[PDB]
Amino acid sequence: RNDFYCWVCHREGQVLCCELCPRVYHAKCLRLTSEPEGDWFCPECEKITVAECIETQSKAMTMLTIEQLSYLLKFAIQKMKQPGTDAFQKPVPLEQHPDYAEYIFHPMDLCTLEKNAKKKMYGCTEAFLADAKWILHNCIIYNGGNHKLTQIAKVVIKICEHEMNEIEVCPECYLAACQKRDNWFCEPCSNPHPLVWAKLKGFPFWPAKALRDKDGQVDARFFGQHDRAWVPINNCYLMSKEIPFSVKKTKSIFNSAMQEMEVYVENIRRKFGVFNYSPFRTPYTPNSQYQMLLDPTNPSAGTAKIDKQEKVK
Ligand SMILES: [Zn+2]
Ligand SMILES: [Zn+2]
Ligand SMILES: [Zn+2]
């Protein structure tokens, strides 16, 4: 059955109906410049359709099957199920709230979300977050926008958004961080992340993995502490033997990071055959392939990796 409360503001009124799902919307809540006539599809449905289309699907979805994604969604559910989330763990019982179904036409809870994931119902990360949001919408309608339970539901949805974002950055890094095997941070991914010297304003130059490029910034993951930051691309150099020196407080902390970085380099050499160090102060470039070159003085010769047509798992 179609909902009666706007998906955006959670209030009743004159609302448009989606043809594909039970969601309804005030026209003004979607800043709709005009009125749709017939066969309207809502923004949640339209975002899911383009994320599930092979021609427009994300980098992460190109490397995952539906079954593989369902395994990562199970770990995301564990992160959402924090201490204090009891009210959202099981379906709301009619024995405690007999008027619940007069207001809530589409119930949702963490156990149902978990069961749906195990049954392979979600074809993209966007679909899991869209379904999870029914928990927050339902809580606002029944309990009210200022209730203590609404505050808890908002955090549950913010955790869901962060976990979906992390899967999209790199599913292999996500899986390694979830399992936490010995020296998981040093495990190379199938398309290995470039190693750089990264300088964040106010901090010493430090070794890091480069996970993404966006608007002139690099998503750096630092060796040692495993913390993260967006760093300007002009403050990043390809890894070299000579170190870009910075005045530091504790020697041993920098030492542990350099030691961990050398374990990562050895893992790359064992798996792909090579690791090319660069001359001092060589700028990092987006999606750099330098470290994998057969001959770093002849880039047109391409990668050292031998293609054995292996099904990667
Ligand atoms: Zn609205
Ligand atoms: Zn829809
Ligand atoms: Zn990765």
Side-chain angles (χ1 to χ4, degrees), residues 18-23 25 41-46:
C18 179
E19 194 61 44
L20 292 175
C21 82
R23 297 177 182 90
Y25 299 75
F41 306 128
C42 85
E44 297 290 352
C45 284
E46 295 275 69

Side-chain angles (χ1 to χ4, degrees), residues 63 169-174 176 187-193 209 211 264:
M63 25 182 298
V169 172
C170 181
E172 306 175 69
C173 275
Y174 186 79
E187 299 174 10
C189 298
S190 60
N191 291 302
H193 310 299
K209 295 180 177 177
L211 263 64
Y264 178 70

Side-chain angles (χ1 to χ4, degrees), residues 77-93 97-127:
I77 280 292
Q78 291 172 24
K79 299 298 233 65
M80 293 160 68
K81 202 172 159 181
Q82 286 305 120
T85 63
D86 307 72
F88 308 108
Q89 281 170 25
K90 297 285 176 179
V92 165
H97 303 88
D99 60 344
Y100 196 72
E102 296 292 338
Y103 303 95
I104 306 308
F105 295 170
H106 196 82
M108 186 54 63
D109 66 273
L110 298 168
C111 182
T112 302
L113 212 56
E114 190 168 9
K115 291 180 194 160
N116 289 353
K118 184 161 197 282
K119 298 182 202 166
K120 270 73 123 285
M121 296 186 207
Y122 305 111
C124 61
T125 58
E126 292 91 341

Side-chain angles (χ1 to χ4, degrees), residues 289-304:
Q289 300 254 255
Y290 183 89
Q291 285 159 5
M292 294 288 312
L293 293 176
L294 171 65
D295 180 350
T297 73
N298 183 13
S300 288
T303 187

Side-chain angles (χ1 to χ4, degrees), residues 5-12 15 25-30:
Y5 296 85
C6 176
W7 178 252
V8 173
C9 73
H10 320 292
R11 304 176 66 169
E12 273 181 305
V15 292
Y25 299 75
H26 290 117
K28 191 176 168 186
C29 284
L30 290 175

Side-chain angles (χ1 to χ4, degrees), residues 63 170-173 176 182-195 209 211 223 260-275 292:
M63 25 182 298
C170 181
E172 306 175 69
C173 275
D182 280 347
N183 288 295
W184 56 274
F185 192 80
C186 304
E187 299 174 10
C189 298
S190 60
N191 291 302
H193 310 299
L195 226 194
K209 295 180 177 177
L211 263 64
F223 282 83
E260 197 191 25
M261 194 207 74
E262 286 163 7
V263 167
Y264 178 70
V265 168
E266 238 313 283
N267 290 346
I268 290 185
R269 283 171 167 150
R270 184 179 299 117
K271 179 174 186 182
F272 301 94
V274 309
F275 182 81
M292 294 288 312

